[PDB]
């Protein structure tokens, strides 16, 4: 009846290590997404300004 107590603790520890693995994943992905979407915005802005520069020349 102890083979189950050490097996229930081995399982709970495995999920915790699993969760903290995901939460950091989710944490890192959001910060890369904020930096990408920040980068996309800047390019859209530059692409609009270049297009305007062309149309203003004929």
């Amino acid at each position: 009846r102890l083979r189950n107590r050490i097996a229930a603790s081995k399982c709970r520890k495995r999920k915790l290590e699993r969760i903290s693995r995901l939460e950091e994943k989710v944490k890192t992905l959001k910060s890369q997404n904020t930096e990408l979407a920040s980068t996309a915005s800047l390019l859209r802005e530059q692409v609009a300004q270049l297009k305007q520069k062309v149309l203003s020349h004929v």
Partner: protein, 54 residues
Amino acid sequence: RNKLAAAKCRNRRRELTDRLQAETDQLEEEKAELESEIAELQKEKERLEFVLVA
């Protein structure tokens, strides 16, 4: 054997892991779209800049 032990381990209390996994996937797809858009837009910037120098 004890496959039932490990299978039962993974089966109970999984809304958390599945909710985390779902959100993890969604972020990897969003991260894919943002990267394709940056690629698309950079081609534009290359393309447009090339017209100015003429």
